[PDB]
Structure 1
Amino acid sequence: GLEHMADEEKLPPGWEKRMSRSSGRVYYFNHITNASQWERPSG
């Protein structure tokens, strides 16, 4: 959908910027090591 702030392609390989199905809370998820947080990665 329409998204001005396209920042979900700036994270390192293995991570994915997703949204928490609880209330719609944006965060990052690493499906390679199973590490997810709102805390920006560094890889």
Structure 2
Amino acid sequence: GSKLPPGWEKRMSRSSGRVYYFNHITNASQWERPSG
């Protein structure tokens, strides 16, 4: 994929903000897309 590892969700920010992805191991979030 695009720099992100597997381990992720497509959470939403404050509400409408963005679908910042969120990892569930490390619980960081981001704009790219993982695929392995």
Give the TM-score taking structure 1 as reference length: 0.48
Inter-partner Cα distance in structure 2 for 1:10 and 1:16: 15
Structure 2: any 5+ residue segments left out of the alignment?
none
User: For the pair shown, which has the larger CA radius of gyration, 1 or 2?
Assistant: 1
Inter-partner Cα distance in structure 2 for 1:39 and 1:26: 10
Q: Could you tell me which residue of structure 1 aligns to residue 7 of structure 2?
A: 14
Deviation at 1:35, TM superposition (A): 2.8
Runs of 4+ that moved beyond 6 A: 9-12
Deviation at 1:42, TM superposition (A): 3.2
* Residues matched between the structures, number: 35
Greater RCO, CA 8 A, separation 6+: 2
Structure 1 residues 10 and 17: alpha-carbon distance in aligned structure 2, compared to 1, 3 A threshold: farther
Structure 1: any 5+ residue segments left out of the alignment?
1-8
